[PDB]
Amino acid sequence: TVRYENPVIIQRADPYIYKHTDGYYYFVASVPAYNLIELRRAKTIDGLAHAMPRTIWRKHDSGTGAQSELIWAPELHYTDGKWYVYYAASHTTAFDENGMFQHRMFAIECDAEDPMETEENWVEKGQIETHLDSFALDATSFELNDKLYYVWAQKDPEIKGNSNLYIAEMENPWTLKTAPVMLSKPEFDWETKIFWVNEGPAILKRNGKVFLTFSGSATDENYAMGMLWIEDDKDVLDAANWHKLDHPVFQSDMENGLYGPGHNSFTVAEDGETDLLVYHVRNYLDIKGDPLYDPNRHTMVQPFEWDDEGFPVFGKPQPFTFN
Amino acid sequence: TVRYENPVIIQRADPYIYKHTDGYYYFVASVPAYNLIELRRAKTIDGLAHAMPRTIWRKHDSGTGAQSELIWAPELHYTDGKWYVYYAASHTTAFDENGMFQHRMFAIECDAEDPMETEENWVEKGQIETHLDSFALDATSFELNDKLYYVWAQKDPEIKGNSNLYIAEMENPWTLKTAPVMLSKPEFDWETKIFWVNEGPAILKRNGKVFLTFSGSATDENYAMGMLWIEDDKDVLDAANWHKLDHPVFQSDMENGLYGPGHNSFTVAEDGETDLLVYHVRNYLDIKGDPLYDPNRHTMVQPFEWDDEGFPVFGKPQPFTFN
Ligand SMILES: [Ca+2]
Ligand SMILES: [Ca+2]
């Protein structure tokens, strides 16, 4: 039995764990100051809480334009022998005329073997351009049929809400080849609480299927995870092939004080078999000051199972450990 | 043999642990953004790495004056049945004409039993005023012969360096009764590398003596700890009664990559007997960008012993654990 003492990582939001071929787990997440991208590594999940970080990229100076504010949800990918980090950044901390954030998507690249050796090894690839000149963030990527796919969240001015999930095939790891295809938009009760939101896409491949988990509603007690699925022998670029579950697959446990589990990612336990769900959560509701600067979204790690139909079973957020 | 897997806390500088009579260890430190005072609690030292913080006080908005920037080195004290936190804060992030920070010393108070219940229980006591209108920070307090003493670091324009150590008897936990008495000024080789500094005072009482540890030199690999001591039956307000050791009592271990240990505090292990040294350290020297915003000072916790003369023996920084 695999069970970690949670929260594994204190004060880290949008957690992303990547188990590399060198035996290390690489941890990357949004830091509370949103001012840089850092990596930590350990051979165990528990080791991550005592793993000393290295900054791989610092935000540009305030007032200098793009990539100068709110460095959000970085993910570390190892694609065709090279390291890439997908992240969102804004030119400003201010809300626009519609009370929305102004992020665009970016990428950094590292050709060196050790992604933690030095930040001088990391180079900017610039903005990931889409069809729309609008709010975009939480990009991830996945491989299928020797093709590379980019999955992200983006605002459509013509669709109600903050963001919808899109897919596109990639020309290279920082450029789209095909036009964005909308896979999901906020529409059900569970994803439209306070704000209409679809974000934090995470990809999981198993049992001849492709699973796409995401987070819906506002970042408070209402924040929950949803899921889309497709048979892996179908065209992933045809939205009609993807099925959206009309209910959350993971949500708050009010009784156990686990508020708004979300912005999930996946990894595998030290046994190399047990599947792990990685997500952030809050332990209180009484946020004071600007909630953006309340740093207490903590990283949780817990195993998940599979049903007889070959679908993941996430269950409930694991209760916290008090030592 | 008491041993913790180090670093105990990632990205926490100026670490301070207070073991309360309810069994809890309360942890308070400088957060990398220097924007608030938070507390966390656990029944074990290792447990603090997974303890969920609560914010007890937030900095004032930028541009509003005192307490609006760079919230540094908070310490939690339980004095006469009430909670107090000593911290330094500036009206600006800017260096003055002499390239120095512009901090003053402050205090917040909480009369409620639970110091973590709500920030609404915490009240500002304002600036702790001294003789000199100058740079002051790192205040601590201690009790002796039923009197309360304030120990802090402060700049004298007429003495070479950034700060000296001072003592004064307190009228109440946020106001001085006697005039400040300088106990130490930077003068030795080990405390004058790059900058002439005396800061981070910490009090330890044992074997009929009062030990005053402090940190000297610039915050790079030259950062080291020094010690003053007094026979506890002597007047603590008379500088001539204090002995200053001419050498460091704790310093960097370049070979094991433990750079610039300092800004220490003390606690006792879960056995209620073993004395623990608590300090921050760096694991690299190649800091990029502004070093003030490099967040990688990590909290270390390790036991110390005593010699046959009744002096503490701090040894060397404990090598890191990699899991
Ligand atoms: Ca993500
Ligand atoms: Ca202190």
Side-chain angles (χ1 to χ4, degrees), chain B residues 13-38:
Chain B
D14 315 310
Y16 192 84
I17 299 168
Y18 165 67
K19 189 181 193 170
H20 195 43
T21 191
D22 60 358
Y24 286 107
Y25 283 100
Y26 284 82
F27 174 83
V28 67
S30 285
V31 298
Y34 313 126
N35 65 336
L36 54 83
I37 302 158
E38 65 189 36

Side-chain angles (χ1 to χ4, degrees), chain A residues 5 7-8 10-12 38 40 42-44 47 49-54 58 119-120 283-284 286 288-289 296 298 320 322-323, chain B residues 5 7-8 10-12 38 40 42-44 47 49-54 58 119-120 283-284 286 288-289 296 298 320 322-323:
Chain A
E5 296 202 328
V8 175
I10 289 296
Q11 289 194 357
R12 288 300 186 269
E38 70 187 29
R40 63 176 96 171
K43 296 146 182 166
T44 69
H50 300 278
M52 295 180 288
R54 288 314 298 255
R58 289 169 287 111
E119 68 165 73
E120 304 180 340
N283 75 316
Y284 62 83
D286 62 323
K288 306 275 169 279
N296 288 320
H298 306 304
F320 301 116
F322 305 99
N323 281 320
Chain B
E5 287 190 326
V8 176
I10 288 298
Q11 300 192 347
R12 290 296 185 275
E38 65 189 36
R40 63 173 101 173
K43 297 162 245 241
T44 71
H50 302 278
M52 303 182 280
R54 293 308 300 261
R58 294 169 283 113
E119 59 159 84
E120 302 295 328
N283 76 316
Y284 63 82
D286 63 325
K288 303 292 163 200
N296 289 317
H298 311 297
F320 303 117
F322 307 105
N323 284 310

Side-chain angles (χ1 to χ4, degrees), chain A residues 46-101:
Chain A
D46 257 72
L48 296 168
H50 300 278
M52 295 180 288
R54 288 314 298 255
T55 300
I56 59 155
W57 184 82
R58 289 169 287 111
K59 77 174 195 55
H60 295 192
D61 284 0
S62 293
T64 66
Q67 309 179 76
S68 69
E69 301 302 344
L70 300 170
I71 308 315
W72 290 354
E75 295 190 5
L76 174 73
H77 292 269
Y78 188 77
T79 308
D80 203 297
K82 296 166 176 77
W83 303 97
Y84 298 90
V85 176
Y86 297 119
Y87 60 102
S90 189
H91 64 95
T92 181
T93 58
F95 272 151
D96 64 10
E97 283 195 321
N98 296 125
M100 282 175 74
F101 287 107

Side-chain angles (χ1 to χ4, degrees), chain B residues 62-116:
Chain B
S62 294
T64 63
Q67 310 184 78
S68 69
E69 300 300 342
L70 300 173
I71 308 315
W72 287 353
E75 298 195 1
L76 176 77
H77 294 270
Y78 189 75
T79 306
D80 308 306
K82 304 172 192 300
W83 302 97
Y84 296 91
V85 168
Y86 299 120
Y87 60 104
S90 186
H91 66 277
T92 181
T93 57
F95 279 139
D96 64 1
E97 328 85 60
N98 303 111
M100 280 177 67
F101 291 104
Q102 309 189 50
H103 292 66
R104 294 298 186 276
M105 300 174 301
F106 297 87
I108 52 170
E109 168 184 25
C110 171
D111 299 345
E113 182 180 348
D114 192 348
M116 228 166 271

